[PDB]
Amino acid sequence: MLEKVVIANRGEIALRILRACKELGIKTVAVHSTADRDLKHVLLADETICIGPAPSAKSYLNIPAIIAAAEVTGADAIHPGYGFLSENADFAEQVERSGFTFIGPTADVIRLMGDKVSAIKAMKKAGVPCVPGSDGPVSNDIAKNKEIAKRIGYPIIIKASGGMRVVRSEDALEESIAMTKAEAKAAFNNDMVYMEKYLENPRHVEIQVLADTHGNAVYLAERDCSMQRRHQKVVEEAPAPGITEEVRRDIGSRCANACVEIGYRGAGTFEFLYENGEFYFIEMNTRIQVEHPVTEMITGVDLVKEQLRIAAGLPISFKQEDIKVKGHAMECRINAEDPKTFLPSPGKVNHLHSPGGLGVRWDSHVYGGYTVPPHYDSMIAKLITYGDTREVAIRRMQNALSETIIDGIKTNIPLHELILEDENFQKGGTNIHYLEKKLG
């Protein structure tokens, strides 16, 4: 099985992985930048290796330096966490070919679900409901485009398969496609674009799944990620309000079927749009996500532990029927940023006071005297609460945040406090545009 794992990430996720590894007696190699010598997970690691200077491009995206670090320590596997190289098939390919286990799916399954039209193909095939759309790439024959666009009706949206554009009227279609195409070739190398029916007030609802090398696959309810700001999630909860065991079972089961159809491997998320009682699949994340803890709180599954087990060729430690959703969980992403302008706020944390008590979980690499660096994201902590009901999780989050002291830098804690007392948020079922409007 796995005796030594390279942690090819940083911050809170590298510590989350270290904690999992230590619990299983798996030896940890922490690959780190110059600027990340002082990370909690790095100081707690069994072996450490500087893989290059502060910029992520010459460190955490340094495919050769990480593989090299695996070769030298005689590592068995590599955990890419989230972001960086986690969705990079070329990296996954270079890992498997160099004789190590990539903790996550196989290269050909990453490429497949990385391309959104071919991903959408798979989900239609598995009986999984998708957005009314082009059902494939759209051609430059614009007569044929108007036809599909007028079938689904306006507004429509044009997305890249591997930077999207809302079209409100037929008058602005022809140009609006050729634009989106030309941006992609110059940017993402791939001129391929597809149409969907643009949903104006959807909720963002994600199903968590696990698939193993034994042919088992499970769904672990959903998360509502609707409370976001310009493509950055701010609060997450599980389960998603309004969604029943009946609907959870159905679309949950269909995501589990799909995992097997495509020979999916490890932890993964099916993202959905949710409007007017109906689910519409949009894309799939082939990795562990930031907001995994809220799912852990309501299922008592250790998603990173199962990632390690699955990667070692073990079956998932439990069966679909052993999972029951109990209570409700909230995660506030605590960022070192100005709570109104969202300008990063790096520098020394002088005093940290973590909250605690019943139903309060604190996932953070930050400690008193830790300097939040400029070179990466602004996330410093994930504050997660559990309650028997949505009300208690919210009230518990409120008390937890007013207990949280972070001196020396600004945080978005005042933002979280605003959201948690918002009457619409308390009511629940706020769509994906709510936070932007409220900040007006």
Ligand X SMILES: Nc1ncc2cc(-c3c(Cl)cccc3-c3cccnc3)c(N3C[C@@H]4[C@@H](N)[C@@H]4C3)nc2n1
> Which residues participate in the annotated binding site for Mn(2+)?
271, 283, 285
Binding residues for hydrogencarbonate: 233, 287, 290, 333
Kindly report the number of other CB atoms within 10 A of residue 283's CB atom: 15
The angle at the Cα of 297, spanning 308 to 226, to the nearest 5 degrees, equals 100
Environment class of residue 167 by beta-carbon count within 10 Å: exposed (0-12), middle (13-18) or buried (19+)?
buried
Active-site residue, selected from the candidate residues 10, 203, 287, 309: 287
Breaks (C-N over 2.5 A) in the chain follow: 162
Separation between Cα atoms, residue 436 and residue 440, nearest integer Å:
7
Nearer Cβ to ligand X, position 166 or 187?
A: 166
Long-range pairs for 182-189: beta carbons < 8 A, 24 or more residues apart? 184/160, 187/163, 188/160, 188/162, 188/163, 189/162
Kindly state whether residue 164 participates in binding ligand X, applying the rule CB under 6 A. Answer: yes
We find the least distance from the C-beta atom of residue 98 to ligand X, in angstroms, to be 31
Residue 288 to residue 435: CA distance in whole angstroms: 25
2, 308 contact by CB (below 8 A)? yes
- Min dist. Cβ of residue 238 to ligand X (A): 17
195-214 residues in contact with ligand X (CB under 6 A) are 196, 198-199, 202, 204
Total residues in contact with ligand X, by rule CB under 6 A = 15
For ligand X, give the closer residue by CB, 32 or 333: 333
Tell me the residue type at 175. E
Question: Mask of contacts with ligand X, 28-67, x by CB under 6 A?
Answer: ----------------------------------------
DSSP 3-state of 422: coil
Minimum distance from residue 153 beta carbon to ligand X (Å): 13
- DSSP H/E element including 437: helix 434-438
Draw the binding track, 120-139, toward ligand X (x: CB under 6 A; -: no contact): -----------x--------
Q: State which of residues 157, 173, 372, 379 lies at the interface with ligand X (CB under 6 A).
A: 157
List the binding residues for biotin.
333
228 binds ligand X (CB under 6 A): yes
Residue nearest to ligand X (CB): 196
Nearer residue to ligand X within complex by CB, 28 or 180: 180
Q: Is 287 a catalytic residue?
A: yes
What residues make contact with ligand X under the rule CB under 6 A?
131, 157, 164, 166, 196, 198-199, 202, 204, 228, 231, 271, 273, 282, 432
